[PDB]
Design a binder for this molecule. Structure first.
Ligand SMILES: CCOc1cc(C2CCN(C)CC2)ccc1Nc1ncc2c(n1)N(Cc1cc(C)cs1)[C@H](CC)C(=O)N2C
Length: 124
């Protein structure tokens, strides 16, 4: 079908804090995943029109990507680190839901998820 609008990334009416955890999530976790060889499918929303996948947004009702997560962190959209961790987990899980066990794109998300969990292990 049409793509939906991307997820909201900025709400100037949401109260804002800096934490060590939110700082680590942007400066370490997002940055490390971004630069990974396997990041590029996850750096922007799924453009299902360009990809010719009419069923993508029939299956995926909670879309998420690292581009949105980067903007959410930069815009202090998250109050609790867990909100950001949940967006990363939504992104990975969306990939496992839409795709099939052993698919190249699933193995890519699995490796990103493993790196995620290694970085989250050291959340301050
Ligand atoms: C046909 C071209 O497709 C893409 C182009 C770009 C460009 C990368 C560089 N930037 C600057 C522009 C977009 C980024 C991503 C894609 N494709 C893409 N994005 C997300 C997903 C995706 N495909 N695919 C398809 C596949 C990918 C691979 C490696 C195997 S199968 C699946 C299904 C939607 C997926 O889950 N994701 C997140």
């Amino acid at each position: 079908s049409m793509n939906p609008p991307p997820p909201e990334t900025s709400n100037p009416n949401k109260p804002k804090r800096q934490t060590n955890q939110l700082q680590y999530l942007l400066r370490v976790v997002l940055k490390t995943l971004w630069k990974h060889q396997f990041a590029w499918p996850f750096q922007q929303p799924v453009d299902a029109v360009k990809l010719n996948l009419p069923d993508y947004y029939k299956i995926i009702k909670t879309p998420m990507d690292m581009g949105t997560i980067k903007k959410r962190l930069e815009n202090n959209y998250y109050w609790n680190a867990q909100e950001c961790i949940q967006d990363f987990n939504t992104m990975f899980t969306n990939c496992y839901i839409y795709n099939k066990p052993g698919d190249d794109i699933v193995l890519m998300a699995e490796a990103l998820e493993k790196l995620f969990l290694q970085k989250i292990n050291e959340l301050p």
